[model samples]
Target: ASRLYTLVLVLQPQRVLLGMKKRGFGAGRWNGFGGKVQEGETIEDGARRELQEESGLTVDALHKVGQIVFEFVGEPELMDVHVFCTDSIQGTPVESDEMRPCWFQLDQIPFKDMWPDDSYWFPLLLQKKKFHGYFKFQGQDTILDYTLREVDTV
Candidate 1:
């Protein structure tokens, strides 16, 4: 009941960082860099680790932007994801076993190539808004039912 994950979006004035997941759960799609929160790792700490592990970039700070509760109809498991963002980064984005990093202008994002849940809040992320989201999934390609709302805090 305590499963956790994280996602980091490195934003620039007119661009954002995304990675094409190469294997594992969300393979073949462009998404932010992140993965499971390891034992003994705080959510933000895990987020930093994953970003470096996947994209070779290290950021000094990341702001907590939102949270998402992921549920699958036929499964008994749930994942709570801590969404984060940072505009400051060091090192160039590079490919790792988990992902291949790429940058896209805010207007040029490939939403159609990312997870169905992504497009829902990506705009909010760009706007620096905090939000809370719930996604009920019955398939890998679509969210059966979902609710996303901007909030004062997440």
Candidate 2:
């Protein structure tokens, strides 16, 4: 089974809203909204549900930005990540048991509290650019290595 996740870029007054999960892989770390793809569900469905479940925001437009596949320690299965982006959304941002909605300034991203690879492509996506990235981790210690590729040149 592959994991499909969506990250919505919501602009509000004072700061930009970013949805983050406080459990599972991203527990205690700040990142985008997403989760595992449920059976009989499309990637878009998973993405939208995750967005609503985590951030309480409803969005209709989600552009596929990129994807990544990598391996982690103690896991025999490979993880596939589908990345999405949207500049607008409906409803208000709220916190859930799985996530906490937080706002950050354009330059004050909580990189230290997020996955190491996030700092690589998030900026480009926020700027309305497309990107693809791959990351390999070694038991949460070394980064091992990573590669970031550009797509959707405009």
Candidate 3:
């Protein structure tokens, strides 16, 4: 079975908000804010909660933009990541124990400091195109294989 996960990106006219994980699963990488869905909360609710918890941002109108399933070599579990984005938000992003929030210009996204799959799908996200993708990782930094495509909806 695939595990459910969420990742929400905050976009501005010229930049995007990302958080550097302080510890745990993705420590030291800059990425969107989100995590596992709680037992009873909807995925959207979980996305919202994770954003607030990690970045101090509150958003009500997140748009679903993409979905990606990540498979790690030698591991049987897969992470089915539901991706969301929004340009509108309340409050500024602040660092939490779990993440340190930061903004980067669209042209300056630190791909080298993020998951390998991000480089493949982030472009689609920026174009406002819906997409679905799958990535097979040799470890955390190397992608052994992958596929991505644009779709009418995700």
lDDT of each: 0.91, 0.74, 0.93
Quote the RMSD, in angstroms, for model 3: 0.8
lDDT of 1 by residue, 5-95 (tens): 9999999998999999999898989998889999998999999999999988999999999999999878787879999999989999989
lDDT of 2 by residue, 99-134 (tens): 888889878988888777777877776666777777
**Candidate 2 lDDT:** 0.74
lDDT of 3 by residue, 36-79 (tens): 98899999999999999998899969999999999998888899
Better of 2 and 3 by lDDT: 3
TM-score ranking of the models:
3, 1, 2
Q: Candidate 1 local accuracy as lDDT?
A: 0.91
How high a TM-score does candidate 3 get?
A: 0.97
Q: Pick the candidate with the highest lDDT.
A: 3
Q: Give lDDT for model 3.
A: 0.93
TM-score of 1: 0.97
For candidate 2, report its TM-score.
Answer: 0.86
Q: Write out the backbone clash pairs for model 2.
A: none
